[PDB]
């Protein structure tokens, strides 16, 4: 209850939110039904419109006007944005040549260049090129400032999760806004687009930029705008706030546009009706820049033009219905549309079973346009699992489709032609980034990057310490002229041991055999050299990975590969090897098919054993360095050491073998050699972060051999592929993946076919950043290169997306 009997006189868009039951006048009061009686009259003036005309010039101030063309308007801070153009012979900002802004040019009393965030809903990346004719203001920011060809949103590519990811630098799983619609089972409360629950603070995790600023003494404009406040009023309010006295003036501001998203839903991303909303956005950008120029701020303020997600063609007739798959359709609740989330309709129903739901949804129709997952088996690059608000069952919907529960949900709930929400690597969901200002670079294109990285840079722009977040601070330093953040590499926490030969063969009782009793200082001094590290600079091109937690592990050298072998997990944390363009693939000799060899550098007590794999009817084993790529028959024996073995389900050995036998060589052929680092990942609580040993839920039967949830590989080569991977003088090129280690290939509907028709497609879906592997393994890669640390941070955030 508000006593809406007070007045907004001189309080319009006040920056303190006064507490009930004084009446409110802030840009949010409408949404709370709490505005003073006279809010509309005083604060939402519209008389005479938004532009000065020739006859208004020098007018007598009339306070009823939406904006002013009188002589006192510059000092009152409330001229129409085109005042100087119309009345003082000035040019529009878009008509001025662009001129490098080397230093901030700010009025006296400004302590730092203000930051203005101009955010646009549904602004698809390809609008920058495709709409460029009708957006001259936006085109000027883009070509004169710093721009990326596109910016990757987070999953799901829905509005609330992405705008709040922009504000916090966090994945939705960590900030808690995991959809536009949510149920939280602990609160027992629902979050909806319509209604008052969504305003409650307990949904909103993390620390958004306006709170980070405020706590550090930087004042912030209010980020939220009621839908019915016209764009022109939002702009004039920002400019008014920029004329406040020094002690009252914010340093950071946001503008938000519901367009082009709003028309994109009705007309599709490229409908002919979309040209108007692009013109209109651009005209708003021009009003802002004209208004800044008037206040002498156009070479002082940093502007970010940034979208939340793109927009795809999606129509009612491209809907899949769960009623065509499930017999028990009324026992589930579905969150529907461009993603699916399924939970039980009632917790009192003990006949509910996720396994039979998943199975009824798996590979059931030839053209099926969604795929079911338990949330922990989603591609780790989505980081969409670690939150009680994300339902255990997830459907990843193909681009251009919806999923709904029953046909009656579509016709009695076409009505629309565009939507978004799909997988964040989809081209149509990509969005935009431009920075323009003294602190951004001049006419500089930067590579695509993810929206989780912007929060750190916004903090950098405002001299703030960011709250802990999912960006990699320093990865976007190349966007900035100054204010760069200079990180240092993390300190290694555990140092390796370098074991020599310490055990005789008969000390091992592992149930392993190898047909190897077949056998000079020519070929004998040479083998000693190889076990001491003599070929280590061929196979370890960027230094050893550092271990950033407390553990016990051994470096092991071999002719063809080097490994860091964990005595705690009984297998390598990492295995590093280089395959040149010239390398040849050989088969495993007949006699050596089941060969496993004790490693005389490593105690029986810290080794796996073959018996456990024999006794374990479900689990087999594979090798991290592939026997197929051995440099010689003799070197091949090294690949069968017990210390190169890792537990693998037969189903997963199909994927791994094809990767190792076919794909590594293919990559070495195309990239002019590749360095590969491979290893296991344990993430049983699906939090994106390395498990400690007491979190492991599965072992090889009768043993202490822990079973990985995933296997990773990082594949590096020279960005200039005229140089071979092992003699590369400049920037690197990387692709990586984190394959889920699963006992079936149910994910891959074509898997009964030959691996050439399905494995590479699985791997592409599970593409990852080196940074994703860092979090999952507690390792730090690329510690010894000739590149600057900032450039290495950017390489570690790279994602190879396989889109066109
Ligand atoms: C992406 O980046 C993010 C952010 O960096 C990473 O997420 C962080 O990762 C940490 C490890 O998972 C985690 O540390 C936890 O935190 C526990 C305390 O957490 C609360 O406090 C947080 C701080 O708020 C304040 O921030 C500043 C200082 O930074 C202050 O000035 C202000 O005053 C702020 O208020 C807060 O952020 C956090 O919020 C979460 O939970 C809220 C609901 O309660 C949500 O609103 C919000 O959205 C957050 O939700 C996410 O995170 C939680 C995990 O916290 C998760 O469950 C949700 O699903 C969701 O994903 C809290 O309010 C701390 O107590 C923990 O310590 C335990 O474990 C250690 C083991 O070493 C023990 O020492 C300790 O005793 C304790 O164990 C005990 O408790 C156990 C139960 O957990 C029990 O089993 C056990 O037996 C013991 O009794 C631990 O440090 C961060 O909280 C988390 N931060 C955020 C924002 O998510 C993320 O990892 C990155 N992702 C990737 C892939 O890299
Ligand atoms: O006023 C703002 C600006 O809010 C920020 C926050 C952070 C922010 O972060 C920053 F600054 F870093 F960009 C920027 C603007 N609003 C965000 C709007 C989204 N709304 C929807 O109703 C909605 C729901 C589903 C949709 N699908 N498609 N479009 C959709 C739109 C109303 C909200 C009002
Ligand atoms: Ca984990
Ligand atoms: Cl949602
Ligand atoms: K077995
Ligand atoms: Na299959
Ligand atoms: Zn939308």
Helix, coil or strand: residue 680: strand
Distance CA 666, CA 687 (A): 33
The two beta strands, 546-547 and 620-623, are unpaired
- Are the CB atoms for 462 and 112 separated by under 8 Å? yes
Query: Per-residue DSSP letters for 65-96?
Result: BSSB-STTHHHHT-B-TTHHHHHH-PPPGGGS
For a ligand 1 pocket test, name from 161, 171, 174, 771 the mutation site with the most ligand atoms within 8 angstroms of its C-beta. Answer: 174
Report whether 797 belongs to an annotated binding site: no
Query: Per-residue DSSP letters for 224-241?
Result: ---TTS-HHHHHHHHHHH
Longest dimension (CA), the chain: 106
The CB density around residue 196, as the number of other CB atoms within 10 Å, is: 10
The C-alpha angle with vertex 387 and arms to 473 and 704, in degrees rounded to 5, equals 90
DSSP 124: B
Query: Per-residue DSSP letters for 569-621?
Result: TTEEEEEEEEE-TT----PPPGGGTT--B--TTS-GGGS--HHHHHH-SS-EE
Tokens of 23: 């009446």
DSSP 260: T
Q: Which residues contact 178 (CB under 8 A, 6 or more apart)?
A: 156, 161, 172, 384, 387, 389, 390
DSSP 31: G
The side-by-side arrangement of strands in the sheet containing 339-344 is 332-335, 339-344, 393-397, 370-374
The CB density around residue 393, as the number of other CB atoms within 10 Å, is: 20
Q: How was this structure determined?
A: X-ray
Alpha helices in 308-384 (DSSP H): 354-361
Q: Which residue's alpha carbon is nearest to atom 50 within ligand 1? A: 174
Tokens of 344: 């039980």
Distance CA 191, CA 737 (A): 34
Distance CA 516, CA 743 (A): 32
Distance CA 286, CA 301 (A): 15
Helix, coil or strand: residue 306: strand
- Are the CB atoms for 130 and 428 separated by under 8 Å? no
Phi–psi pair at 538, nearest 5 degrees: -75, -40
Nearest alpha-carbon partner for 253 in 74, 24, 96, 27: 27
Residue in the structure block whose two tokens are 């917790």: 347
Nearest alpha-carbon partner for 14 in 25, 29, 3, 28: 25
The two beta strands, 370-374 and 393-397, are antiparallel
From residue 753, alpha-carbon distances to 84, 94, 757 in Å are 70, 58, 7
Phi–psi pair at 646, nearest 5 degrees: -140, 145
Nearest alpha-carbon partner for 747 in 358, 478, 283: 358
Query: Per-residue DSSP letters for 481-498?
Result: SS------PPPP-BPPB-
Helix, coil or strand: residue 123: coil
DSSP 529: H
- Are the CB atoms for 636 and 630 separated by under 8 Å? yes
Report whether 689 belongs to an annotated binding site: yes
- Are the CB atoms for 339 and 395 separated by under 8 Å? yes
With 0-12 CB in 10 A as exposed, 13-18 as middle and 19+ as buried, what is 445? exposed
Distance CA 50, CA 383 (A): 45
Where are the strands (E) in 168-313, listed by range? 182-184, 189-191, 252-257, 302-307, 312-313
Q: Which residues contact 727 (CB under 8 A, 6 or more apart)?
A: none
Q: Tell me if 375 CB under 6 Å of ligand 1.
A: no
Helix (H) or strand (E) holding 626: none
Distance CA 295, CA 44 (A): 22
The CB density around residue 486, as the number of other CB atoms within 10 Å, is: 9
Distance CA 469, CA 111 (A): 27
Helix, coil or strand: residue 768: strand
For a ligand 2 pocket test, name from 115, 116, 119, 120 the mutation site with the most ligand atoms within 8 angstroms of its C-beta. Answer: 119
The CB density around residue 502, as the number of other CB atoms within 10 Å, is: 10
Query: Per-residue DSSP letters for 538-581?
Result: HH-TT-PPEE-S---EEEEE-SS-EEEEETTTTEEEEEEEEE-T
Residue in the structure block whose two tokens are 């998203």: 261
Q: Which residues contact 742 (CB under 8 A, 6 or more apart)?
A: 377, 649, 651, 652
Helix (H) or strand (E) holding 449: strand 449-450
Distance CA 323, CA 404 (A): 9
Nearest alpha-carbon partner for 195 in 186, 205, 182, 207: 182
362 belongs to the catalytic site: no
Cα dihedral across residues 77, 78, 83, 87: positive or negative: negative
Distance CA 437, CA 460 (A): 14
Q: Which residue's alpha carbon is nearest to atom 22 within ligand 2? A: 193
- Are the CB atoms for 675 and 541 separated by under 8 Å? yes
Cα dihedral across residues 679, 680, 682, 687: positive or negative: positive
From residue 642, alpha-carbon distances to 221, 571, 575 in Å are 62, 9, 13
119 CA distance to ligand 2 middle (Å): 8
Report the atom number in ligand 1 closest to the C-alpha of 203.
Answer: 46
As assigned by CATH, the class of the 505-797 domain is alpha beta
The two beta strands, 252-257 and 562-566, are unpaired
Residue among 4, 159, 284, 472 flagged as catalytic: 159
- Are the CB atoms for 143 and 436 separated by under 8 Å? no
Alpha helices in 36-180 (DSSP H): 39-43, 73-76, 83-88, 127-130, 136-144, 159-168, 172-175
Tokens of 742: 């699963």
Distance CA 29, CA 22 (A): 12
The CB density around residue 593, as the number of other CB atoms within 10 Å, is: 9
Residue in the structure block whose two tokens are 């052929």: 669
Q: Tell me if 157 CB under 6 Å of ligand 2.
A: no
- Are the CB atoms for 652 and 743 separated by under 8 Å? yes
Helix (H) or strand (E) holding 516: none
Tokens of 78: 């409330």
348-386: b (≥16 Cβ within 10 Å) or e: eeeebebeebbeebbeeeeebbbbbbebbbbbbbbbbbb
Distance CA 529, CA 68 (A): 84
Tokens of 465: 């310490």
Helix (H) or strand (E) holding 778: none
With 0-12 CB in 10 A as exposed, 13-18 as middle and 19+ as buried, what is 506? exposed
Report whether 638 belongs to an annotated binding site: no
Report the atom number in ligand 2 closest to the C-alpha of 158.
Answer: 27
Cis, peptide link before residue 378, omega less than 30° from 0: no
Report whether 687 belongs to an annotated binding site: yes
654 CA distance to ligand 5 middle (Å): 15
Name residues with Cβ closer than 5 Å to ligand 7, which is an ion: 261
Helix, coil or strand: residue 294: helix
Number of residues in the chain:
804
Helix axis angle, 136-144 to 275-294, nearest 10°: 60
- Are the CB atoms for 422 and 395 separated by under 8 Å? no
Q: Which residue's alpha carbon is nearest to atom 6 within ligand 2? A: 163
The CB density around residue 192, as the number of other CB atoms within 10 Å, is: 12
Q: Distance of alpha carbon 255 from its chain centroid, rounded?
A: 23
Helix, coil or strand: residue 302: strand
Report whether 162 belongs to an annotated binding site: no
Query: Per-residue DSSP letters for 266-279?
Result: HH-TT-GGGHHHHH
Experimental resolution (Å): 1.9
For a ligand 2 pocket test, name from 119, 163, 308, 453 the mutation site with the most ligand atoms within 8 angstroms of its C-beta. Answer: 163
Q: Which residues contact 567 (CB under 8 A, 6 or more apart)?
A: 552, 553, 554, 602, 606
- Are the CB atoms for 95 and 231 separated by under 8 Å? no
Nearest alpha-carbon partner for 160 in 140, 142, 137, 176: 176
With 0-12 CB in 10 A as exposed, 13-18 as middle and 19+ as buried, what is 231? buried
- Are the CB atoms for 363 and 333 separated by under 8 Å? no
The CB density around residue 135, as the number of other CB atoms within 10 Å, is: 21
């Amino acid at each position: 209850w508000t006593a809406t009997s007070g007045s907004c006189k001189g309080r319009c868009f006040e920056l303190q939110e006064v507490g009930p039951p004084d009446c409110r006048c802030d840009n949010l009061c409408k949404s709370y039904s709490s505005c003073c009686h006279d809010f509309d009259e005083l604060c939402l003036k519209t008389a005479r419109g938004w532009e000065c005309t020739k006859d208004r010039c020098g007018e007598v101030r009339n306070e009823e006007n939406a904006c002013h063309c009188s002589e006192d308007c510059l000092s009152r801070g409330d001229c129409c944005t085109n005042y100087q153009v119309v009345c003082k012979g000035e040019s529009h900002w878009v008509d001025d040549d662009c001129e490098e802004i080397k230093v901030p040019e700010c009025p006296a009393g400004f302590v730092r260049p203000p930051l203005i965030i101009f955010s646009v809903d549904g602004f698809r990346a390809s609008y920058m090129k495709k709409g460029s004719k009708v957006m001259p203001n936006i085109e000027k920011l883009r070509s004169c400032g710093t721009h990326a060809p596109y910016m990757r949103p987070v999953y799901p590519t829905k509005t609330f999760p992405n705008l709040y990811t922009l504000a916090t630098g966090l994945y939705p799983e960590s900030h808690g806004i995991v959809g536009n619609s949510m149920y939280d089972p602990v609160f027992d409360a629902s979050f909806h687009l319509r209604g008052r629950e969504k305003f409650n603070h307990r949904w909103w995790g993390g620390q958004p930029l306006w709170i980070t600023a405020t706590k550090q003494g930087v004042r912030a404009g209010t980020f939220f705008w009621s839908v019915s406040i016209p764009h022109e009023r939002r702009i004039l309010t920002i400019l008014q706030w920029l004329s406040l006295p020094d002690n009252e003036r914010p340093s950071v501001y946001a503008f938000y546009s519901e367009q082009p998203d709003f028309s994109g839903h009705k007309y599709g991303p490229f409908g002919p009706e979309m040209t108007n909303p692009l013109r209109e956005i651009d005209k708003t950008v021009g009003q802002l820049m004209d208004g800044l120029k008037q206040l002498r701020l156009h070479r002082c303020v940093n502007v970010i033009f940034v979208g939340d997600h793109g927009m795809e063609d999606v129509t009612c007739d491209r809907t899949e219905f769960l009623s065509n798959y499930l017999t028990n359709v009324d026992d589930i609740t579905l969150v529907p549309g461009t993603l699916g989330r399924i939970r039980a309709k009632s917790i009192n129903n003990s006949k509910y079973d996720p396994k039979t739901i998943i199975a009824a949804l798996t590979c059931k129709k030839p053209d099926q346009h969604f795929k079911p997952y338990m949330k922990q088996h989603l591609p780790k690059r989505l980081h969409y699992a670690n939150n009680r608000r994300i339902e255990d069952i997830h459907l990843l919907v193909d681009r251009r489709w919806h999923v709904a529960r029953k046909p009656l949900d579509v016709y009695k709930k076409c009505f629309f032609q565009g939507d978004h929400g799909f997988d964040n690597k989809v081209n149509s969901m990509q969005t935009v980034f431009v920075g323009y200002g003294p602190t951004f670079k001049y006419r500089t294109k930067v590579p695509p990057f993810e929206n989780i990285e912007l929060y750190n840079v916004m903090c950098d722009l405002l001299g703030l310490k960011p709250a802990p977040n999912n960006g990699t601070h320093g990865s976007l330093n190349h966007l900035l002229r100054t204010n760069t953040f200079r990180p240092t590499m993390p300190d290694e926490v555990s140092r390796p041991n370098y074991p020599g030969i310490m055990y005789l063969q008969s000390e091992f009782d592992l149930g392993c055999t190898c047909d190897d009793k077949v056998e000079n200082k020519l070929e004998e001094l040479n083998k000693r050299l190889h076990t001491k590290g003599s070929t280590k600079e061929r196979h370890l091109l960027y230094g050893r990975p550092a271990v950033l937690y407390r553990t016990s592990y051994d470096i092991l050298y071999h002719t063809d590969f080097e490994s860091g072998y964990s005595e705690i997990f009984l297998m390598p944390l990492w295995t590093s090897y280089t395959i040149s363009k010239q390398a040849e693939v050989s088969s495993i000799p007949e006699h050596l098919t089941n060969c496993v060899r004790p490693d005389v550098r490593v105690s029986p007590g810290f080794s796996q054993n073959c018996l456990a794999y024999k006794n374990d009817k479900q689990m087999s084993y594979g090798f991290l360095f592939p026997p197929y790529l051995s440099s010689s028959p003799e070197a091949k024996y090294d690949a069968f050491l017990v210390t190169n073995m890792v537990p693998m389900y037969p189903a997963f050995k199909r994927v791994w073998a094809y990767f190792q036998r076919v794909l590594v060589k293919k990559y070495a052929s195309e990239r002019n050699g590749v360095n590969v680092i491979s290893g296991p990942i344990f993430d049983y609580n699906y939090d994106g972060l390395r498990d400690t040993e007491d979190e492991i839920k599965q072992y090889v039967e009768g043993s202490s051999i822990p079973v990985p949830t995933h296997y990773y590989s990082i594949i590096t080569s020279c960005l200039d592929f005229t140089q071979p991977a092992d003699k590369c003088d400049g920037p690197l090129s990387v692709s990586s993946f984190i394959l889920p280690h699963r006992p079936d290939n149910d994910e891959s509907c074509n898997s009964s076919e030959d691996e050439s028709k399905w494995v590479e497609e699985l791997m592409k879906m599970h593409t990852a950043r080196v940074r994703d592997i860092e979090h999952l393994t507690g390792l730090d890669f690329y510690r010894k290169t000739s590149r600057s640390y900032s450039e290495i941070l950017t390489l570690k955030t790279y994602l190879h997306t396989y889109e066109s």
